[PDB]
Design a protein around this ligand. Structure first.
Ligand SMILES: *Cc1ccc(-n2ccnc2-c2ccccc2)c(OC)c1
Ligand SMILES: *Cc1ccc(-n2ccnc2-c2ccccc2)c(OC)c1
Ligand SMILES: [Ca+2]
Ligand SMILES: [Ca+2]
Ligand SMILES: [Cl-]
Ligand SMILES: [Cl-]
Ligand SMILES: [Mg+2]
Ligand SMILES: [Mg+2]
Lengths: 9, 229, 229, 9
């Protein structure tokens, strides 16, 4: 459910 | 070493090609071969290693959650067996990444940016192991993730500005660990909020490009605080 | 037979689970094991076989086109080598599907719906082989796709109504073969138009659900005619 | 570029 780090879009 | 006969530079070049083709399994195999050449990784090369294995394990985690949700509603052995198969494959990828960090990426990383990056990775992949753990080793897996995150936090607060993207991504994932794994939502909220505020007060020092790097990850912290409060 | 020890019904059940988890490589391996049980496939089982291998080869084709485009702009050996690796893996999947159809799905398919389905598959995967062929076998690969499509067309026009979704999808793909592979755009346009018109005149016979099945594929024919004219 | 058969959405 929560956001971990992810690459930019 | 299935990649032992290929040049290190060729493995890096093909890893970038696999990223463009969205062939992340190939990309991880190329970067695994590059790491096993025995040399430290550059900043760009560390990014390739992260991108490859995050996408691979990301698809495994998504498939595991689909199968586990079907399994929960049911409770033949087929659903359990197939969830176990995906789960075993996910654990193998996590063990592979952790093996690369332990042999010997972490012990040779002296700079803060490299050492914090690898320790954050160690916490991340122990966290992915903890998401599927149910036996006698769950608490030790959880503490292994917590210990890796904590050492990375200690170094980042000593050697990095509050707006450093690696420090920000580390705090973001440690807060997710607190909320999702450790059953500590108040610690998760407190970490995400202090990380956001201290980065906000440091934005005035940054260039236009560094400003965009930091605010991107600050938005992820804001998204979680909106979800949690 | 890596799946030789699993029950046929369990392989079908896990194929459906792999589809829900979007694990199409697993899905193809399950359906390959189900086919190798030696029994004919039901309508639903034929759909599972199509879904699994179309998604697998679909990702391979997309990756091949990305790498081939990079290779064309460049002309080290890395880009050529990696495009060759993906190309060889794509050809292996196509050869696997064609082997299943030849041993022994096609020869045991007596009904029009099953035989046309398998012959359309044979044309499709020879078409995928033709997309990457460059040597002395390209013309024979192209003629193999044309021959499979043609026999399927002959049966479908004899045994199926013009609105049958398999007949419509077959004509759609044969028209794509004419345009993309055989350098026959006028044959492609003529086939797509007569297929559309003859289906339009038969829609009045269909139920609400069959009407939706046919018009969905008719829209794909319309999209190509808009693109080609 | 053109559309071959694909599953419904
Ligand atoms: C976990 C994490 C945080 C931040 C980044 N990142 C954002 C912008 N650049 C980076 C980066 C690239 C290479 C090496 C370290 C950081 C990140 O990217 C992998 C991961
Ligand atoms: C190539 C093709 C055409 C049409 C279908 N299709 C649409 C709706 N149902 C079907 C179908 C399902 C199972 C078996 C045959 C046809 C299609 O689906 C695989 C493929
Ligand atoms: Ca060398
Ligand atoms: Ca049996
Ligand atoms: Cl299984
Ligand atoms: Cl290669
Ligand atoms: Mg060093
Ligand atoms: Mg028969």
């Amino acid at each position: 459910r929560p956001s971990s780090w992810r690459q930019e879009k | 070493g299935a990649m032992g006969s290929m040049e290190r530079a060729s493995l890096i070049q093909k890893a970038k090609l696999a990223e463009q083709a969205e062939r992340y399994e190939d990309m991880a195999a190329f970067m695994k071969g590059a790491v096993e050449k025995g040399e430290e990784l550059s900043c760009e090369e560390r990014n390739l290693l992260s991108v490859a294995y995050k996408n691979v394990v990301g698809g495994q985690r998504a498939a595991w959650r689909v199968l586990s949700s079907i399994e929960q509603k049911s409770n033949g052995p087929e659903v359990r067996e197939y969830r176990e198969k995906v789960e075993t494959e996910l654990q193998g990828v996590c063990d592979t990444v952790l093996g690369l960090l332990d042999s010997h990426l972490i012990k040779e990383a002296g700079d803060a940016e490299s050492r914090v990056f690898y320790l954050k990775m160690k916490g991340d992949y122990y966290r992915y192991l903890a998401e599927v753990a149910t036996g006698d080793d769950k608490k030790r897996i959880i503490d292994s993730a917590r210990s890796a995150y904590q050492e990375a936090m200690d170094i980042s607060k000593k050697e990095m500005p509050p707006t450093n993207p690696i420090r920000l991504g580390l705090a973001l994932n440690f807060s997710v660990f607190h909320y999702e794994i450790a059953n500590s939502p108040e610690e998760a909220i407190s970490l995400a909020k202090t990380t956001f505020d201290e980065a906000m007060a440091d934005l005035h020092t940054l260039s236009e490009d560094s400003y965009k790097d930091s605010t991107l990850i600050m938005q992820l912290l804001r998204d979680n605080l909106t979800l949690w409060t």
